[PDB]
UniProtKB/Swiss-Prot annotation, chain A:
First-to-last residue of the parent protein present: 929 to 977 of 1514
Quaternary context: Component of the SWR1 chromatin-remodeling complex composed of at least ACT1, ARP4, RVB1, RVB2, ARP6, YAF9, VPS71, VPS72, SWC3, SWC4, SWC5, SWC7 and SWR1, and perhaps BDF1.
Biological role: Catalytic component of the SWR1 complex which mediates the ATP-dependent exchange of histone H2A for the H2A variant HZT1 leading to transcriptional regulation of selected genes by chromatin remodeling.
Family membership noted in the UniProt record: Belongs to the SNF2/RAD54 helicase family. SWR1 subfamily.
Organism: Saccharomyces cerevisiae (strain ATCC 204508 / S288c)
Misc: Present with 656 molecules/cell in log phase SD medium.
Chain's gene name: SWR1
Compartments where found: Nucleus
Protein name: Helicase SWR1
Amino acid sequence: LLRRLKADVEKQMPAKYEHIVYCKLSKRQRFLYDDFMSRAQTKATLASG
Amino acid sequence: DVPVPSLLRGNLRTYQKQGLNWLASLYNNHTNGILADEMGLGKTIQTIS
Ligand SMILES: Nc1ncnc2c1ncn2[C@@H]1O[C@H](COP(=O)(O)OP(=O)(O)O)[C@@H](O)[C@H]1O
Ligand code: BEF
């Protein structure tokens, strides 16, 4: 193997931030989501299949 | 590591030169290994070198 990371070349590399942006589901997406959940329960969700 | 640079015309940094340093033990000893370096550190420059 040969492995190196940015820590050796660091302090010249700028910062890296991971943001998390939350977006609420829309109205028709809330209706369609629950619709697919119920219709999926009619198929027994196919979880163990 | 005693590299002869000729036809290197581009410029390489120190840790990549160490990449060729650790690459010198492969072909000279007839050994094959995986070189995995952090993305953005220019492995291709090491291969071309
Ligand atoms: N000596 C150097 N000086 C400046 N930039 C370099 C040098 N060596 C490599 N790079 C940059 O690093 C990048 C390396 O990309 P590449 O080797 O194709 O994939 P990766 O490095 O992610 O494996 C190139 O886009 C190049 O601009
Ligand atoms: F590892 Be680099 F992104 F090719």
